[PDB]
Amino acid sequence: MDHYLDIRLRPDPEFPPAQLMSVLFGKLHQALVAQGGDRIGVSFPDLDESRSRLGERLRIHASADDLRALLARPWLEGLRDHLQFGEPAVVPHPTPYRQVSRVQAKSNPERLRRRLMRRHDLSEEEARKRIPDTVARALDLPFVTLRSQSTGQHFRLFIRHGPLQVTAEEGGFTCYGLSKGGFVPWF
Amino acid sequence: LSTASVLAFERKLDPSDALMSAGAWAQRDASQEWPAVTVREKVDVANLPSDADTLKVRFTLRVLGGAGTPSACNDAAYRDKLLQTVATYVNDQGFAELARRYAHNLANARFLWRNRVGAEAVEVRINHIRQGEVARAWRFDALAIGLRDFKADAELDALAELIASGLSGSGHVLLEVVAFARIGDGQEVFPSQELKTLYSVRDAAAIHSQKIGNALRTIDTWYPDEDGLGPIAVEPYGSVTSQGKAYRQPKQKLDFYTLLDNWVLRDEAPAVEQQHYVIANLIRGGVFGE
User: Which cysteines are joined by disulfide bonds (chain A)?
Assistant: First the structure.
């Protein structure tokens, strides 16, 4: 990433910090995956495990040409009213090694029993007995409240923060910003 | 000359419920016959019709006037003193500042709480209904108009003048506000949650009258400390639910009760900012005294 863009969410009374950050992340998601690009990634510089929050600002690490069209895109723009956004600035030469990733799992035994019974064509009791109480697992890390078509109320967002390392392996990132198996510049 | 144990001020600029519907930008010319959005279950959720990319909100607003005129007062001396102070303030300077701030708030989409989030184009149309006829209309753009910055415009000045006149009691004033926000096909609206039950009237989604008047009265911009948040809904003790912090604490002299008590008993006219905040609170109305 040759250009880092820092989006600082300005406090607003109309919306709360959690809802504001959730909306910003959701809007950015469509502004990056649909926009294209070889490597698209963001990190929460304000991430703190004490408050269990997702941070009050985000840093998008991308190339210069990628950010040139990303910031220019109307979808990624227009929210300057509630969020203070600057221009690209060269990141400092020293950078740490951190890889942010997402955990995909189901915490409901019913969904698992249904998925199992829908493959081998088992019975209701066969699917129920095959799913025990030990199959319900979920991340306990801080999860921002995101309300969308997935859940009516605030849905948790599972975000895993990679431990700080010395060696930083870069590379092409996912379309939605998921970990591609390499750390990202930490600065 | 002590205060009255019983004091109440009827609210002014009280709007009504805001009906919501869906349609296409092409149909904006003739909004008539736009199908409404009915609440559905999945909890309760509300989504635009199968083929609809623009949301519409329609709400009226009335200007009663006589803000300073108290509705009930135990002591006559206190009522006379308050009326005298109000007349003096109006003579010295008019409400044109409050009217201008209200006009900007109505022009922009500050009222929408969640609907504005993710809106590409928000077009507001404020009409004027006099004797049942549309005397004069106005059309603005919430996106083009700065949310955190106040800019002067001929239409905004005219609206502020009309509001000031109505508040002063020149004549009846009725304004029909209609907003159109482009969100997207099949999007999910965020109506006012009821105590998940979504607020619906006549099998149509809407927003609470008080919930609208709360944002519309965001005229408190004279707080002692500013962190860049912007206007905060006028409330006693400058309380904020989302921020969880209450600005303008009673310990300071900016408190509404303290300012009014001083400007009434000691006749101490506070800074223009404090006077504006006090007039805004009196216009909003409430229960004071004991």
Answer: none
- Identify all chain B residues contacting A153, using CB atoms and an 8 Å cutoff: 43, 196
Distance between CA atoms of A182 and A100, rounded to whole angstroms? 9
Cβ proximity of A113 and A40 under 8 Å? no
What would the CATH number be for the domain defined by A3-104+137-185?
Answer: 3.30.70.2540
Which experimental approach was used here? cryo-EM
Residue written as tokens 């949650």?
B193
Look at strands B200-201 and B204-207 and give their pairing: antiparallel
Q: Which residues contact A122 (CB under 8 A, 6 or more apart)?
A: A116, A130
Angstrom distance (rounded) from CA B27 to CA B33: 10
Answer whether B242 sits within 8 Å of A82, measured CB to CB.
Answer: no
Q: For A1-151, where are the alpha helices, taking DSSP H only? A: 17-33, 64-72, 109-120, 124-130
Q: Which residues in chain A are contacts of B45 at CB distance < 8 A?
A: 152
Measured in angstroms, the CA of B168 and the nearest CA of chain A are apart by: 30
Structure tokens at B107: 């022009």
Closest-CA residue to A7 (of A15, A16, A23): A23
- Cβ contacts of B162-166, under 8 Å, gap ≥ 24: B162/B99, B162/B128, B163/B63, B163/B95, B163/B99, B163/B102, B163/B103, B164/B94, B164/B95, B164/B96, B164/B98, B164/B99, B166/B63, B166/B65
Given an 8 Å threshold on Cβ–Cβ distance, is B43 in contact with A152? yes
Distance from CA of B220 to the nearest CA of A (A): 12
User: How far apart, in whole angstroms, are the C-alpha atoms of residue B61 and residue A12?
Assistant: 25
Concatenate the DSSP letters of all residues of B210-243 into one string. HHHHHHHT--B---SS--S---B---GGGB-TTT
| Residue that has been written with the tokens 């895109």 in this structure | A73
Residue with tokens 């975000």: A159
A161 in catalytic set: no
Classify residue A176 by its DSSP letter: S
Q: Do B36 and B55 touch, CB atoms closer than 8 A? A: no
CA distance A1 to A51: 29
Residues of chain B immediately before an interruption (C to N > 2.5 Å): 42, 195
Q: Kindly state the tokens that stand for B236.
A: 């006693």
Chain A contact set for B113 (CB, 8 A): 14-15
